[PDB]
């Protein structure tokens, strides 16, 4: 019942499909799949940032870090999708390629270990309720 669990699904769902895809495509097929995962992203992000403000001030600055990564792991994808596109139809073409996959696989790995932050958060909280 939880929007973050639900966005982080919904990004890893996304890094999924490119990545069983991204191997025979084209880059009219694949630039529309690293928008799929960006705005993906961008949803956790906004959800994640809505949800600070419930959480332990003790919680906030490695959930803050966690998002910064993921951030960075976009523009990483979107750095190597570019370079694939440019070598399109080289010897670089499948490197380049790979390259994206990577950068997928960690922003996914990231998005696992942000939920994992905003769990024990969460428990955390629980540990810090009052009376009435
Ligand atoms: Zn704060
Ligand atoms: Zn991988």
Redo the contacts with the bound molecule.
Sequence with gaps: NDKVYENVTGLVKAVIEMSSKIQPAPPEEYVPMVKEVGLALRTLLATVDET?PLLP?ST??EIEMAQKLLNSDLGELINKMKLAQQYVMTSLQQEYKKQMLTAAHALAVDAKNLLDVIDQARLKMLGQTRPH
């Design positions: 600070i001030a906030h600055r």
